[PDB]
C-alpha cells in the first residue's frame, strides 16, 4: 500500500513497469516542450510544468485566481484546470508521455549479458540490427497454405524460370546473329584479320555477358525460392531490396515487421513454457558448450517461469515523467535561469515523438518514417542513460548530460553521496583546551555557543517567567543578550547531556556524552583522562557537540554512552581511563622508595630507640610537613583503617580482619599509605612501585571486582594525587641533565677501523659492492648497540629523562638514544639504508652532510603515515560493509560443539609455564564441557565464565585441553546466540539479546592501523592483514604438505624441487619450482632429509595460501590458522585484540558452499549458495527419494563475501548499481530489510539495540501497592 | 567564496488543514471513447461543461447524452483541395484520361 505511505513497513519490493501501470500513476499526459513564459516567468499549458498536471504553484491558488480560499479544497477549476490543493504535490505528481510508436528499454538490450538476447536466443550485435532498423525480421510464416503452396508455387516458379530460359536463348541467339553478321561483315574484305576477330570477341563477349546476367537472375530465383522454403521465424532478413522481392513474389504466408513492434509482436507471439521445458530437456540430457548456453539462458527463462511477471516489459508504450519539483526551475535574483539537464532531454523526446506523430498521420514513405523511428529510440536510450550506446549527448562545454540512472550510480548518487552522512541542526564546534578540575562525567561548554545551542529552550523558559511575554520579544531578548538569559539558561542547561566527536572517527568510544557545565571562555574545557580514547591532543584539535532532543535520546545520552560509563575498551578490556604521562609521573615519583633518605627507621639501639615509628599517618604527615620526614623514607607506620595484603591478614587475624576496626603494623613508605588510601576501604594494601603496568593491573582488577561508579570516583582521586604529586617531583629538561657517554670515541675508533678494513678490502677488488654495504651496515648496527648499552650503563637513575622513560610515561630507550649517544643510519627513499652512518647526537649538534641525510627518512614517514591512514580507512570500510549483520539474537544455541584451546602446555621437565596468549584467546569464553582433572573430579562446569579464578582453579588442577564453547559453532539461523559469545568486555558481564558485535568487532580490528610499521619479499605489515582478509595467494608461497611419512628433501640448480614420501602407497607427491627465494623450513630444527611430515606440514619457509590448507585439512585449521596468523602481526606491535572479534569475521567468510553436482536439485555448477539454503535443500527434496547435491566447503574474500549479499537495496551501494537492480527487477526479489545498512537509508529504526521487538513493545505503568499511595 | 540565494516562482503560506467546513462540492463524471470514467469534483456552484481533458490521453465527454455535439472538426487543408485551387477540371480530367489512355496500351498492349 504505497499510496498514503503509513509508518510500517515490511518488505519493500521491486518488479517491472508495465504501460498499464504507468498510464495508472501519471496525472496527465506532457505534449509541449514548453516550460515557462519568457516575460511573466508563469509556467505554461501541457508542458513540462503544466500546472493542471503537475498541480499548482502556491498554496491553495488556482491559476485564473478566483478560487484563492482553503475552504476550497480537492475543487478542479473550469476555467483554469488546475485542483486547488498545496504547492507540496509537485514533488510527487507523475506524468507520462505518450508514444506513437513503440521502443524498447536500454537495461534490457545493451548491458552484457543481454537478457532480450539471452531470452529470445539471438546474438546481440544482431539484436542491434533489428532495434536500430537496419535489418528485416520475420514474425511468423503458416506452414500448412505454404505446406501446399509449396507445390503449386514450385511449379508456378519452374514455369517463371521456363520463360526466363527461353528470353535467356532469345537473347542469346540474338547476340549470336550479330555475332554471324560480324563473322559475315569481315570476312567478306580480304584484310588484316587481327582487328576482324576484335569484333567476333566483342560479340562472343557480349553473349558471355547476355547469359552470365541470366544466370545471376536464375540464381536470384533459386534464392527466393529457397528461402522461403527455409522460412522460419527469429530469421533475419537482410538486403530490403531481396525482402521486396519476397514481398512482391512470395509476400503472402508469412509475416514480418521490422523494430521494436517487431520485437514486441515476437514477445507476444513467445510462450516460454515450451523453451523451458526444451531447456530443462537439454541440460539433463546433454552436455558441453549447448548445455552451458541452456543454463545461462535457463536463468532468466526459469525466472520468468516462476514470476506471474509478463515478459512484455523489455518493450515500451509511455514513458513516465519525473515530477517537477526533482528537476527545479530555480531563478536567481538577477534574471538568471538553472535547470538540472533532464529538461533537454525531455523536451528533445517530445520534440520526436510529436514529429513522427505529424508524420503518421500525413503518410510518408518508410525512409523519413524509420529514420525518425531510430531517432527517438537513440533519444530514449539518451535519456535512460546517457553514455552507454554511441556516444553520450553533450550540451555547452561539452559536458554529457546527466541522465536518470546517474543520479543513482557512481559516487553522486542517491546510494552513496547522500548515504555517507548530512549535516545537521543544533550543531556546534570549537577548540578544546585541558579541564583538570572537572568530575569525569563533566565537560566545559563557551557560553555564546551554549546560548546558540539552547535556543529553544531558552525561549520557552523565559517566556514562562514573562521575562518577555512573546516569543518574537523572546528572540530579540536573546538577540541582545540581556543579562537575564544566563540565570535562565543554567536553569535550562543542568542535567541535559551532551555529545562530543573529533573527527576522524575511529572506534566505538569515539562519540561520548557528557553532561555540561558553564565556561566563561570561548573553548570547550575537557577532562584530561578522556583524550587516550579520543586520540586529542591540544596543539589545536577540534571537537564538534551535537544535542539530543526527545525524551529516548536524552535517555540513551545518559545511561548507554555517558563518559563514566566507558572505561574499559571493547577490543581488548584493557582500560582507556588510566591515568597517562603526566600523573603517571607523579604516581611513580610517590611511590618510589630511597634509601638513604632523610628520617628512615633504623633499628640502632643499645643507646636509643628505633626512632623511625610513627603511630599514625596524620602523626607522619605532621612530621613531613615539618622539616623531619621525606615522602619517600622508610618507616613503620601502624595503620588502622587499611586493609592489609592477604598473607599479613591471614597470619594476624587469621579471616575476620574487618579493618573498619583494627590495627596493624606495617615497614611502607609514606607514599605508599599517602596513595593506597585512594584506593576503596575493601581494597587490600598493595605496597608496590606504581609502575604503569601496576596501574593497570589495579585497575583491571578494580573494575572487575567493583562497580563503576567506585572505579570511576577511584580513577578521578588518583588523577588529582597524580598531578599534585607531578608537579613537586622537579621533573625539568636542562642541557646539564643531558649527559654524553664518556666512552663514545674509543667506541666509534673501534668500529671504525674495521670499518676501514672492509673498505680497504673493497678497495684491493676482493668482494663487490653489496657485499661492502652488507658488511658495512652489520658494522654499524653492532656499533649502535654497543654505545647505546654504554649509555643506558652510564645513566643514573633519578636523572629526570631516564625517569620519564622507565615509569612508562612516554618514549622509548630509542629516542634518548638518539638525543644522547648516535643517530645510528638513517634509509633511502627507495628504503635501502645508507652505509655513511651519522655519529653525532643532537646534543652536540649534527653537520650539514648529516642533517641532509637524516631528510629522506624524515620526509618519508611524513607521507607514508596519511598513506596508512587511508587505507586502513579503507580497510574499515570492508570489513563493516562485510560484518555489518552479525547480531545477537536467541539466548541459547544449545549446541555442544566448540573450539579447543591450548592454555599452558606442559614443560618436557613437567610444569605449567603458564602461555603468554590467554588474555587474548583464554579468558571471557563460555566453556562448553567441563573440564575434570586426571579422572577425578570436575573443577569448573559447563557455562562459566572462565574469568581469573577459574584459569587458577585450571591451572592448580594441571590441565591444558578445554573445549570452549564459541562463536564458528554458533547454530542460529542469522546472527549468533548470547551464550556462546561470551562476556562482553566493555561490560563484563555477558551480552545482552541486541548487541551489534559486528560493528564492534569491525571497529575493533581496524581501528590499529597508522601503527603498523612492516620491516627495515615476503609481506609482513599490514598489507599482509589486507591479503589475508581477501584471502589472495600470498607472493612468498611456501607449500605444505599432501601426506605423512618421510620426505626426500632434493635439490636441482638454482632453485629446488623435493618429492615427498607417501606411507599411504599413492602416488609420490612431487613438489616441482621450489625457487631460490626462500629457505628451508625450521621445525621443532632443520628440515632433514628422510624427516617425518606431516600431512599439511608447510614445506619452504614463508606463507601458505589458505584455499590449498582448506583443500586438505578441511573447514577446521583452516580457523585455527587464519586467527593465529593474523593475530601475529598486532602482537608485533605490543597491540593485543581479543580473539573473539576476528572470529566473527572468520565465520563470515565460510557462510558459503559450491556446486558441483546440480544433479536433481535446482542449481548450477560452479555456482556458490549459503550453506545453511543447501542444508534445507537435500532435507526438503531428499524426501521420497535422495536427490544429488554434492557440496564443497569454499573460503572467499570480504569483497567477494560481501557482494554476493541477498538483500539488494544493501548490495546497491557498492558497485554496479545499473547491473545489480536489473537482474533483480527480474526477479522480482523482494527485500527484507533484516540489515543495518538498509534500514538507515529508508530512515526507519535499525533492527539492533533499541530497535527489536523485544526492547520496543515495553508497556510502563505504576505497581499498584504505590497507586493507592498517590 | 561563493553563496547565492534563489526561490522558485512561487509563494508559500501557513493555514490549518481543517477537513469539514469546505466549499460545497458536486461530483461530476466525464466519459472517453474507450470507457473510461473520470470522476471530476467540481463546486456545488459550478458549470459543468460536455467535455473535458483527462488522463486518458484525449478530452473524455460527459457521460449524458444531452450535449453530443460532434460538428465543428474538418481538414482545412487536403491534397485534393490544393490540387483544385490551382488546377482546372478539365486539365485534370483531361491528364487523368491521358494517363488512363496509356496504361490501356501499356498493360492491354
Ligand atoms: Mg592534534
Ligand atoms: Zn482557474
Ligand atoms: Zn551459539
Same mark, same amino acid.
Given at each position: ?340 539537464? @533532464?529538461?533537454? &532531454? ?10 513522427? %506523430? $505529424? +508524420?503518421? *498521420? =500525413? ?81 566545559? @561548554?563557551?557560553? &555564546? ?10 525561549? %520557552? $523558559? +523565559?517566556? *514562562? =517567567? ?101 572505561? =574499559? ?702 | ?109
Amino acid at each position: 500500500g504505497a499510496m498514503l505511505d503509513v509508518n510500517f513497513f515490511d518488505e519493500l519490493r521491486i518488479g517491472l513497469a508495465t504501460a498499464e501501470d504507468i498510464r495508472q500513476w501519471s496525472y496527465g499526459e506532457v505534449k509541449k516542450p514548453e516550460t515557462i513564459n519568457y516575460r511573466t516567468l508563469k509556467p505554461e499549458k501541457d508542458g513540462l510544468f503544466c500546472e493542471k498536471i503537475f498541480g499548482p504553484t502556491r498554496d491553495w491558488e488556482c491559476y485564473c485566481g478566483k478560487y484563492k480560499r482553503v475552504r476550497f479544497k480537492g475543487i478542479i477549476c473550469e476555467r483554469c484546470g488546475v485542483e486547488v490543493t498545496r504547492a507540496k504535490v509537485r514533488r510527487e505528481r507523475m506524468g507520462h508521455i505518450e508514444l506513437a510508436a513503440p521502443v524498447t528499454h536500454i537495461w534490457y538490450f545493451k548491458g552484457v549479458p543481454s537478457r532480450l538476447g539471452y531470452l529470445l536466443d539471438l546474438a546481440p550485435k544482431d539484436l542491434e540490427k533489428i532495434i536500430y532498423f537496419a535489418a528485416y525480421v520475420i514474425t511468423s510464416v503458416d506452414e500448412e497454405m505454404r505446406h501446399n503452396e509449396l507445390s503449386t508455387l514450385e511449379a508456378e516458379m519452374a514455369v517463371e524460370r521456363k520463360a526466363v530460359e527461353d528470353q535467356r536463348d532469345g537473347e542469346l541467339e540474338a547476340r549470336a546473329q550479330k555475332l554471324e553478321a560480324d563473322l559475315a561483315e569481315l570476312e567478306a574484305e580480304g584484310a588484316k584479320a587481327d582487328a576482324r576477330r576484335k569484333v567476333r570477341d566483342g560479340g562472343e563477349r557480349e553473349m558471355r555477358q547476355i547469359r552470365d546476367r541470366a544466370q545471376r537472375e536464375l540464381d536470384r530465383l533459386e534464392d527466393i525460392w529457397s528461402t522461403f522454403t527455409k522460412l522460419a521465424p527469429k530469421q533475419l532478413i537482410v538486403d530490403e531490396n531481396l525482402y521486396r522481392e519476397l514481398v512482391d513474389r512470395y509476400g503472402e504466408y508469412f509475416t514480418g515487421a521490422m523494430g521494436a513492434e517487431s520485437i514486441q509482436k515476437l514477445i507476444e507471439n513467445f510462450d516460454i513454457d515450451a523453451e523451458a521445458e526444451s531447456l530443462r530437456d537439454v541440460i539433463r540430457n546433454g552436455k558441453g558448450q549447448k548445455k552451458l548456453r541452456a543454463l545461462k539462458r535457463l536463468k532468466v527463462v526459469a525466472a520468468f517461469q516462476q514470476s506471474g511477471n509478463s515478459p512484455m516489459g523489455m518493450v515500451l508504450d509511455a514513458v513516465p515523467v519525473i515530477p517537477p519539483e526533482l528537476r527545479p526551475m530555480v531563478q536567481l535574483d538577477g534574471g538568471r535561469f538553472a535547470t538540472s539537464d @533532464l529538461n533537454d &532531454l525531455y523536451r528533445r523526446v517530445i520534440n520526436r515523438n510529436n514529429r513522427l %506523430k $505529424r +508524420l503518421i *498521420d =500525413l503518410g510518408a514513405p518508410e525512409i523519413i518514417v524509420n529514420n525518425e523511428k531510430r531517432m527517438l529510440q537513440e533519444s530514449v536510450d539518451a535519456l535512460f542513460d546517457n553514455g552507454r550506446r554511441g556516444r553520450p549527448v553533450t550540451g555547452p562545454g561539452n559536458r554529457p548530460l546527466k541522465s536518470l540512472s546517474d543520479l543513482l550510480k557512481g559516487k553522486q548518487g542517491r546510494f552513496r553521496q547522500n548515504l555517507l552522512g548530512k549535516r545537521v541542526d543544533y550543531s556546534g564546534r570549537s577548540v578544546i583546551v585541558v579541564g583538570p578540575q572537572l568530575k569525569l562525567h563533566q565537560c566545559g @561548554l563557551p557560553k &555564546l555557543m551554549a546560548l546558540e545551542l539552547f535556543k529553544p529552550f531558552v525561549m %520557552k $523558559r +523565559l517566556v *514562562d =517567567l514573562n521575562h518577555a511575554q512573546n516569543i518574537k520579544s523572546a528572540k530579540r531578548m536573546v538577540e541582545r543578550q540581556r543579562p537575564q538569559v544566563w540565570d535562565v539558561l543554567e536553569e535550562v542547561i543542568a542535567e541535559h547531556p551532551v555529545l562530543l566527536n573529533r573527527a576522524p572517527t575511529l572506534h566505538r568510544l569515539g562519540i561520548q556524552a557528557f553532561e555540561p557545565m558553564l565556561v566563561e571562555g570561548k573553548a570547550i574545557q575537557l577532562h584530561p583522562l578522556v583524550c587516550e580514547a579520543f586520540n586529542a591532543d591540544f596543539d589545536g584539535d577540534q571537537m564538534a557537540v551535537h544535542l539530543p532532543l526527545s525524551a529516548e535520546a536524552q535517555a540513551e545520552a545518559r545511561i548507554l554512552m555517558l563518559s563514566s560509563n566507558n572505561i =574499559l575498551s571493547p577490543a581488548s578490556g584493557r582500560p582507556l581511563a588510566m591515568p597517562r604521562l603526566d600523573m603517571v609521573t607523579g604516581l611513580y615519583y610517590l611511590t618510589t622508595e630511597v634509601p638513604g633518605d632523610t628520617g628512615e627507621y633504623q633499628p640502632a639501639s643499645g643507646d636509643h630507640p628505633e626512632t623511625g615509628v610513627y603511630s599514625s599517618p596524620a602523626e607522619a604527615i605532621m612530621a613531613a610537613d615539618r622539616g623531619v620526614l621525606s615522602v619517600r623514607a622508610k618507616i613503620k607506620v601502624r595503620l588502622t583503617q587499611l586493609r592489609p595484603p592477604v598473607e599479613i591478614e591471614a597470619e594476624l587475624f587469621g579471616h575476620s580482619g574487618w579493618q573498619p576496626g583494627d590495627a596493624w603494623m606495617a615497614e611502607t613508605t609514606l607514599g605508599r599509605v599517602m596513595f593506597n588510601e585512594l584506593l576503596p576501604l575493601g581494597y587490600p594494601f598493595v605496597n608496590k612501585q606504581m609502575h604503569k603496568k601496576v596501574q593497570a593491573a589495579i585497575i583491571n582488577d578494580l573494575a572487575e571486582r567493583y562497580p563503576m561508579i567506585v572505579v570511576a570516583q577511584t580513577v578521578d582521586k588518583l588523577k588529582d594525587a597524580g598531578f599534585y604529586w607531578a608537579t613537586r617531583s622537579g621533573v625539568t629538561v636542562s642541557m646539564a641533565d643531558v649527559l654524553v657517554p664518556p666512552r663514545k670515541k674509543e667506541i666509534l675508533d673501534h668500529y671504525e677501523e674495521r670499518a676501514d678494513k672492509v673498505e680497504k678490502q673493497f678497495q684491493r677488488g676482493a668482494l663487490n659492492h653489496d657485499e661492502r654495504n652488507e658488511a658495512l651496515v652489520e658494522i654499524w648496527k653492532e656499533a649502535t648497540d654497543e654505545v647505546g648499552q654504554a649509555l643506558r650503563e652510564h645513566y643514573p637513575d633519578d636523572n629526570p629523562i631516564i625517569t620519564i622513560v622507565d615509569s612508562g610515561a612516554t618514549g622509548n630507550f630509542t629516542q634518548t638514544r638518539t638525543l644522547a649517544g648516535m643517530k645510528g643510519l638513517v634509509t633511502n627513499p627507495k628504503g635501502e639504508f645508507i652505509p655513511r652512518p651519522v655519529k653525532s647526537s643532537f646534543r652536540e649538534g649534527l653537520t650539514v652532510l648529516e642533517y641532509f641525510i637524516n631528510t629522506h627518512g624524515a620526509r618519508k614517514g611524513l607521507a607514508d603515515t596519511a598513506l596508512r591512514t587511508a587505507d586502513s580507512g579503507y580497510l574499515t570500510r570492508r570489513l563493516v560493509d562485510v560484518s555489518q549483520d552479525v547480531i545477537v539474537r536467541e539466548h541459547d544455541c544449545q549446541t555442544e560443539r566448540g573450539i579447543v584451546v591450548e592454555l599452558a602446555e606442559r614443560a618436557p621437565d613437567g610444569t605449567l609455564i603458564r602461555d603468554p596468549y590467554i588474555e587474548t584467546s583464554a579468558y571471557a569464553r563460555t566453556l562448553g564441557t567441563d573440564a575434570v582433572d586426571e579422572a577425578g573430579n570436575v573443577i569448573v562446569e559447563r557455562g562459566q565464565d572462565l574469568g581469573d579464578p577459574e584459569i587458577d582453579a585450571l591451572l592448580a588442577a594441571g590441565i591444558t585441553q578445554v573445549k570452549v564453547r564459541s562463536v564458528l559453532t554458533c547454530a542460529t539461523s542469522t546472527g549468533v546466540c548470547a551464550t556462546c559469545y561470551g562476556r562482553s568486555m566493555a561490560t563484563g558481564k555477558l551480552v545482552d539479546i541486541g548487541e551489534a558485535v559486528g560493528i564492534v568487532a569491525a571497529q575493533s580490528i581496524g581501528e590499529p592501523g597508522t601503527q603498523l610499521t612492516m620491516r627495515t619479499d615476503i609481506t609482513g605489515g599490514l598489507p599482509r592483514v589486507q591479503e589475508l582478509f581477501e584471502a589472495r595467494v600470498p607472493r612468498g608461497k611456501a607449500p605444505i604438505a599432501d601426506v605423512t611419512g618421510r620426505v626426500r628433501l632434493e635439490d636441482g640448480e638454482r632453485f629446488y624441487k623435493i618429492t615427498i614420501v607417501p606411507d599411504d602407497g599413492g602416488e609420490e607427491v612431487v613438489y616441482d619450482k621450489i625457487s631460490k627465494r626462500q629457505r628451508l623450513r625450521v621445525f621443532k630444527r632443520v628440515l632433514s632429509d628422510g624427516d617425518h611430515v606431516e600431512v599439511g606440514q608447510q614445506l619452504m619457509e614463508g606463507s601458505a595460501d589458505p584455499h590449498e590448507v582448506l583443500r586438505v585439512q578441511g573447514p577446521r585449521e583452516v580457523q585455527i590458522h587464519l586467527v593465529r596468523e593474523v593475530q601475529e602481526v598486532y602482537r608485533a606491535q605490543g597491540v593485543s585484540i581479543h580473539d573473539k572479534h576476528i572470529e566473527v569475521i572468520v565465520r563470515q567468510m565460510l557462510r558459503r558452499v559450491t556446486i558441483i553436482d546440480s544433479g536433481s536439485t535446482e542449481f548450477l555448477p560452479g555456482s556458490l549458495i549459503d550453506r545453511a539454503e543447501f542444508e534445507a535443500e537435500n532435507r526438503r527434496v531428499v524426501a521420497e527419494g535422495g536427490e544429488p547435491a554434492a557440496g564443497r566447503p569454499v573460503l572467499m574474500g570480504i569483497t567477494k563475501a560481501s557482494l554476493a549479499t541477498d538483500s539488494w537495496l544493501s548490495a546497491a551501494s557498492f558497485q554496479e548499481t545499473t547491473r545489480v537492480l536489473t537482474d533483480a527487477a527480474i526477479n522480482c526479489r523482494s527485500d527484507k530489510l533484516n540489515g543495518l545498512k538498509e534500514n538507515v537509508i529508508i530512515g526507519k529504526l535499525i533492527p539492533a539495540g533499541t530497535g527489536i521487538n523485544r526492547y520496543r513493545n515495553i508497556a510502563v505503568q505504576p505497581t499498584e501497592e504505590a497507586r493507592a499511595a498517590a | 567564496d561563493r553563496v547565492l540565494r534563489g526561490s522558485r516562482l512561487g509563494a508559500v503560506s501557513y493555514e490549518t488543514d481543517r477537513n469539514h467546513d469546505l466549499a460545497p462540492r458536486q461530483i461530476a463524471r466525464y466519459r472517453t471513447d474507450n470507457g473510461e470514467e473520470f470522476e471530476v469534483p467540481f463546486a456545488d456552484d459550478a458549470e459543468i461543461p460536455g467535455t473535458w481533458l483527462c488522463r486518458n490521453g484525449m478530452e473524455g465527454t460527459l457521460i449524458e447524452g444531452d450535449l453530443p455535439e460532434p460538428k465543428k472538426v474538418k481538414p482545412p487543408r487536403t491534397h485534393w483541395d490544393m490540387l483544385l485551387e490551382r488546377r482546372s477540371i478539365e486539365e485534370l480530367e483531361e491528364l487523368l484520361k491521358e494517363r488512363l489512355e496509356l496504361i490501356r496500351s501499356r498493360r492491354r498492349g
